[PDB]
Design a protein around this ligand. Structure first.
Ligand SMILES: CC(C)c1cnn2c(NCc3ccccc3)cc(NC[C@]3(O)CCNC[C@H]3O)nc12
Lengths: 65, 275, 286
């Protein structure tokens, strides 16, 4: 009766969203506002905003009623 | 997230015909109610639509001059609230002026835009007693608006999908040298799309991408490689058809005209005066 | 409406909860903002470890939220001296909490009120995150937040130093605190004020450095504290295994970015190692 991690399977009906840690090396973070030292201290990074923006741009793009 | 949202599940509709059906049902149920409660005073569904377009424009004006500065998300949420409310309600029952004010009032709360009732109603070009009466009416209609939305308050707007698409273009589509020059015109197109019923018929990502693509075409830039390659053929056909139908909805839009709007406003004031 | 009030379940500064038919009803500014927040958030979320909003209804400026009826919460489990919290029980509570939190975080929502009495347990042993009255969306730069959120005993140090912008760490730290409370059967860091809370944090876990927390000095309410070495983790939790200690250390990392996410926590060996989390039907009841 062990446990095993299952990734969250949620259909987004759109293009694949790049993983958060990859964003910086894929060039995405060159086009979002850098997180200021206070924000980084609090735990907010530009990767969060960029990931949210991409997820919303791709969500349900292929879906139809 | 939109892909499991209430907006996608319950408030995105199959066609303009379905929206016309819901609005005609609203107009007929108000007529049946009034007749059971007792004429050329009634407004027709197209007249209701003209009034709703005029009052969505009024709501946009109010949200525009609002202080403290209303975030664009609040304005979009309020306009979507107004559209959804008048999908299933006649302007002959609930007056669109008060409903639009209640839409802004509820959207400010839902978006987490912090305003108190006095500062909300101080934005109206009226009298302080008129402001107090307006606040009383808004408070009376707040729960009605919430009920008519079926308690679905989160509204997914096209602005953040627009920003995500701008980021994706700037990163992965070098053919487009500077995607930012597409924003302004695309923003304009976004506004036009918001005037139509598109917000009840297509996803916010589809609306945002349609605006960006229309801006690109208006700029003479071909962005078909972005769809084919960057977005990685049946699905491409459905997406292209959705975009073209949206552009046609924008093209077929008829803005309200002054004389017909004045006549319908007189008719509506008579409807609310009687009974 | 369609519900008749059976029992009285409690009172708060916001609402009163009754047990009815089984469901629980929570009864010039207009409609209450906390109720609207709960409505707007719980309508967009659907997960077994998140409290379900079954219905809402009311009259005038009153409104009645309807939820599934929740038998107990983790606070009653912790304080019940007849109950023994085996490592399997703790693992299961932690697993349900983290799965609900993972779902919540993927939809860009922070709970910001995590604590044992906000983790409710039903008759089947399913833990649900509840009391979304302070929950907020995150990931949008144009929105600023208040640092007074999260009750003091479970408040993350970044919050205690006035972090306006934050992320999942504010929940994860609370989860860590909750884990600590599950292990010690007592609040980990029961500070009396913000100063006392920070002092307890640093005296137990060590005064963090410019290395462990690269930008701590930038927080608007940052206070330089005495350099407490910090009690070693295996000394605070004498019975914690190495995997459990790694989980605790990840949840209590002073750097909020470095602090483990719900996804990363779920991937740790502690949850996959023997013994497995106990099934909900076997979880203890007070
Ligand atoms: C989803 C909500 C409305 C709900 C569902 N069931 N339920 C119960 N059931 C009985 C019981 C549970 C747990 C411990 C003891 C008794 C009590 C209660 N109390 C109101 C709270 O504010 C809510 C959470 N935070 C602290 C609480 O005081 N809320 C709820």
């Amino acid at each position: 009766a062990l446990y095993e991690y299952q990734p969250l399977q949620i259909e987004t009906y759109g293009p694949h969203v790049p993983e958060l840690e990859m964003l910086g090396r894929l060039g995405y973070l060159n086009h979002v506002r850098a997180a200021s030292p206070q924000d980084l201290a609090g735990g907010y990074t530009s990767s969060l905003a960029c990931h949210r923006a991409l997820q919303d741009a791709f969500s349900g793009l292929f879906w139809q009623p | 997230m939109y892909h499991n949202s209430s907006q996608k599940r319950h408030w995105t509709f199959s066609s303009e015909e379905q929206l016309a059906r819901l609005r005609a049902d609203a107009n007929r149920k108000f007529r049946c109610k009034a007749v059971a409660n007792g004429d050329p005073v009634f407004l027709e569904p197209h007249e209701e639509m003209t009034l709703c377009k005029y009052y969505e424009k009024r709501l946009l004006e109010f949200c525009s001059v609002f202080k403290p500065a209303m975030p664009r998300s609040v304005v979009g949420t309020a306009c979507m609230y107004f559209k959804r409310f008048y999908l299933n309600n006649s302007v002959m029952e609930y007056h669109p002026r008060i409903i639009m004010l209640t839409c802004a009032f509820l959207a400010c709360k839902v978006d987490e835009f912090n305003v108190s009732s006095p500062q909300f109603v101080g934005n109206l070009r009226e009298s302080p007693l008129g402001q107090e009466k307006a606040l009383e009416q808004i408070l009376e209609y707040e729960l009605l608006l919430i009920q008519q939305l079926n308690f679905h308050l989160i509204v997914h707007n096209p602005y953040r999908p627009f920003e995500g698409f701008l980021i994706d273009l700037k990163t992965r589509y070098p053919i487009l040298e500077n995607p930012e020059i597409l924003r302004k015109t695309a923003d304009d197109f976004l506004n036009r799309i918001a005037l139509t019923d598109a917000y009840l018929l297509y996803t916010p990502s589809q609306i945002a991408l349609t605006a960006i693509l229309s801006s690109a075409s208006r700029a003479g830039i071909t962005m078909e490689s972005y769809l084919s390659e960057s977005l990685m053929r049946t699905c491409l056909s459905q997406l292209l058809d959705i975009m073209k139908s949206m552009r046609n909805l924008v093209k077929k839009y008829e803005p309200p005209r002054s004389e017909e709007v004045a006549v319908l406003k007189q008719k509506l004031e008579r409807c609310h005066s009687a009974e | 409406k369609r519900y008749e009030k059976l029992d009285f379940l409690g009172e708060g500064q916001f609402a009163t909860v009754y047990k009815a038919r089984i469901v629980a009803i929570k009864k010039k500014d207009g409609i209450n903002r906390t109720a609207l927040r709960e409505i707007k958030l719980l309508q967009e979320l659907s997960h077994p470890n998140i409290i379900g909003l079954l219905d809402a209804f009311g009259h005038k400026s009153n409104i009645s939220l309807v939820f599934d009826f929740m038998e107990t919460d983790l606070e009653v489990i912790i304080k019940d001296n007849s109950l023994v919290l085996t490592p399997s029980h703790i693992k299961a509570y932690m697993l349900m909490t983290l799965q609900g939190l993972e779902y919540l975080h993927q939809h860009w929502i922070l709970h910001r009120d995590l604590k044992p009495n906000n983790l409710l347990l039903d008759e089947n042993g399913v833990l649900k995150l509840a009391d979304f009255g302070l929950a907020k969306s995150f990931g949008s730069p144009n929105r600023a937040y208040t640092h007074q959120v999260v009750t003091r005993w479970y408040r993350a140090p970044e919050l205690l130093f006035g972090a306006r912008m934050y992320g999942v760490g504010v929940d994860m730290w609370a989860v860590g605190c909750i884990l600590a409370e599950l292990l010690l059967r007592v609040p980990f860091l029961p500070g009396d004020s913000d100063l006392d809370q920070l002092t307890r944090i640093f005296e137990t876990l060590g005064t963090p450095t410019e290395e462990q927390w690269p930008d701590m000095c930038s927080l608007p309410d940052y206070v330089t504290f005495k350099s407490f070495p910090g009690i070693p983790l295996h000394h605070i939790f004498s019975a914690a295994g190495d995997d459990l200690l790694d989980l605790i250390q990840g949840l209590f990392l002073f750097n909020p970015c470095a602090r483990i996410t719900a996804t990363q926590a779920l991937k740790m060996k502690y949850f996959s190692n023997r013994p497995g989390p106990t099934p909900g039907c076997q979880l203890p009841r007070p």
